[PDB]
Design a protein around this ligand. Sequence first.
Ligand SMILES: Nc1ncnc2c1ncn2[C@@H]1O[C@H](COP(=O)(O)OP(=O)(O)OP(=O)(O)O)[C@@H](O)[C@H]1O
Ligand SMILES: Nc1ncnc2c1ncn2[C@@H]1O[C@H](COP(=O)(O)OP(=O)(O)O)[C@@H](O)[C@H]1O
Ligand SMILES: [Mg+2]
Lengths: 752, 187
Amino acid sequence: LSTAILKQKNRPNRLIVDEAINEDNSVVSLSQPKMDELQLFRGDTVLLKGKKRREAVCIVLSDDTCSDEKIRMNRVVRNNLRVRLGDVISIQPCPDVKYGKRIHVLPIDDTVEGITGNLFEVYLKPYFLEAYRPIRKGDIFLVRGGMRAVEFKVVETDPSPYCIVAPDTVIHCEGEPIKREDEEESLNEVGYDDIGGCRKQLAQIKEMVELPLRHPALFKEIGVKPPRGILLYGPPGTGKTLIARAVANETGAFFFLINGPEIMSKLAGESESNLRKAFEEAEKNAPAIIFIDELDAIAPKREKTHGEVERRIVSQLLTLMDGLKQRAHVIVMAATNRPNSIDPALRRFGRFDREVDIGIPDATGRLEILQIHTKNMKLADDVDLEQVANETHGHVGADLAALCSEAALQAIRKKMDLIDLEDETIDAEVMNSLAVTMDDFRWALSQSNPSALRETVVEVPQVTWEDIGGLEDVKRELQELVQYPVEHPDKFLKFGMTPSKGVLFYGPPGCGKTLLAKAIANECQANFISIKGPELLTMWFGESEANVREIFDKARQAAPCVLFFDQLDSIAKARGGNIGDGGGAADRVINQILTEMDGMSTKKNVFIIGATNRPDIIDPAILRPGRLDQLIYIPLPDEKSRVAILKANLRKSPVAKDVDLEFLAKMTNGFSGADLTEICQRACKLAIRESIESEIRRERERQPVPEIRRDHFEEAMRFARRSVSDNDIRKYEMFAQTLQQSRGFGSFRFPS
Amino acid sequence: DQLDSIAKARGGNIGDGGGAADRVINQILTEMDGMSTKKNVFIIGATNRPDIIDPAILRPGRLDQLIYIPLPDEKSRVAILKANLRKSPVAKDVDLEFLAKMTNGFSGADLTEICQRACKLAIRESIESEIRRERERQPVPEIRRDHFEEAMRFARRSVSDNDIRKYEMFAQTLQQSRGFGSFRFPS
Ligand SMILES: Nc1ncnc2c1ncn2[C@@H]1O[C@H](COP(=O)(O)OP(=O)(O)OP(=O)(O)O)[C@@H](O)[C@H]1O
Ligand SMILES: Nc1ncnc2c1ncn2[C@@H]1O[C@H](COP(=O)(O)OP(=O)(O)O)[C@@H](O)[C@H]1O
Ligand SMILES: [Mg+2]
């Protein structure tokens, strides 16, 4: 019942907006049973209320084709109401409307440029002649006529705001021309419906701000003071400032904007006086809303601040919020990236009473954000927004906006070829043909990366599941590790068990441990963070452990995310190794990771994968189920596997049919995966050597090798050698034996 | 959560960082039990390896109770399996009592792994089954016994017998110096 406030409810006044048939800018049509329900007569003047606090007046008529639940209204009033077809409006009778005494109108520049004749005679008088048009202060209405229609705005009325344009009502159009920029900016103002995925957060913010202002009698009856401070926190791009703008636009209360840095002043006492002036102005126009952005910069902790100016600024803000003189009807909103950096005294009651967490949207939230951002763009029928929403695993609202913008830019880049790119004008046909398609969104998805993880980005060599030869059972567990919890979450809820998200790769060098991680980076539908082992460690005392939390929090923020620790033995050690180990910092890095993988915090869809050459030196606590659940042995490839490895390496290469890969696999009894790749790499170099030597001969006489041949492999083999010795293998075969001999050595079967 | 990190033996590493690690132990020492009056603040810590713990931290008045949480016996292994599956629909025919007897050195985390792996095998069949239905059109209500059977063959005990003995050795030293074993007042 937290979002019981959002439910628009079923009301007679709420009318679905639909197109009009014969109505002009001052009349609307309704169904006769609806007038019988609302007790309206044909010809009554009415109030129509739109989003972002817009209002209109028209004349209500009867339409026999009108659905009872819909209202007919033309494009002019729809733009006046900031309402599109399918939305809802509120309708109520408009009494006591008097004939206008004087109305002031002004044209729109983009509709009037090139029109030099008398605007009044050509446009206004025929439009208003004997019509008695009801208009409001601020209406935007279109008048046809002459060479081009000229758009008009009402700026002043007598009386205000509602009048009937009678024949005697003097109409004048002299004044300063209106700028197109103001009209377009008003159109593109942000509303509540612009927010996406913050339904719970929007519920909370609405309860704090909108409800007390609209219905003070309720809080007076229950006899409590509603919360007067809201703190919005979360990762960047979640919509904190956007929610601020939406609240500012959709409230009939004074809004003041404060930016943490811009309040500062070198001269002593002027920043405190700036804060005092802002709060004095807000109290002057009470009720008022104050938004302080980047509150961390203005208001850090007083205890850990050496600057006197910063401490006194925090104290001044603290006193303004909850001093002796309680602020009457001022709601202070604040937004910050790091709520912990804020002075704890500010996070009290009476000062930012209810902190609101703007989080990363889920699959449904990102679909809503995509629909919001793509409404202004033209989409082909093939475009699927559900698929794109499902693909953007770690994306935040700003990331989704960047994705939409990148798809739009790619559409123009596709239309690049036709135009010369330097013509004075572009031909109208190619402009009309330009439209975004699904392939543009797919390209943007390939290019787009979450803003949170722009640091942990590495270019990967584009390895696909086919490029890995053998390891079929190792592969199958690897799709199922990531796909099952993300693609079928409901199944785990059904059977009631959490997924197992830990995997460790151990084996002899060069057998495919790193290559599998490259495959996961591309094929798996989840964010990928690649971590080298010693990259976390830092010479400072607390930095090495802090970097561990930063990496794990990035994965939690952008879940589902695969956290791959290459050479995990560098990070993870048996603990208690040497007296001098950088002061025990490596021993202390272990204890920080053990809490991140499995600690007193809720589990997220973070998949920790680690590859190590020597796995016996790993801390036993790391190998525990719940941290690294599965221990997969990546052994030296067998003759069946070696057959596939040769195919995978030479698939792109043109190789003669005379060569058989089966004989290659049979001869190499103990070669690793890298050894077989070096054999194929050596074959090209000899083929390269022969090919260039041939062309130089052919060029010399003036002044061949289409495919890799059998004698190249025979020549390349004699340089090849086995990378991993038997004594190295026995170490790895020994560790797997301990795991098998521990349990599962005897097949386990239930009794009949 | 990991008390051996913040509270380690002093003097083990000479020149450890700036010496800050040893001074933090001193700060914890005074805060837990010092000249100030003690409120109702209960300090609870967990550590994998308690041998590196500073003996001062272990002194009564600071973590006075040293609770040893050993590997579950057979009776606990039944409870651990039931506790994991209390919200999980399982077949009646599967007997959790047998599973406890087969596993001997399995941890509570290891037992959950068998149950979790059993769930993933069932989910694999359910996905494949619903794929087959789509092919013919154009399943697994509860966890079955064969799902646990295939899960167990991948299972393995995480704590080695050597890793156990480092804990019995620490536990025994407490009991070795605990006194004359059982204690009865004269008469
Ligand atoms: N199964 C395989 N299929 C295809 N290529 C393979 C396979 N195994 C190894 N390779 C080749 O081995 C090389 C590197 O292997 P990879 O990086 O996966 O090994 P690693 O054992 O994880 O690494 P390292 O031991 O060198 O730290 C690449 O040339 C890759 O093509
Ligand atoms: N929930 C959302 N719905 C619609 N658009 C969003 C949402 N969240 C973010 N955006 C888009 O991303 C941008 C977010 O930037 P903003 O939230 O102002 O940054 P910050 O959170 O650091 O103040 C906005 O310009 C908006 O267009
Ligand atoms: Mg490697």
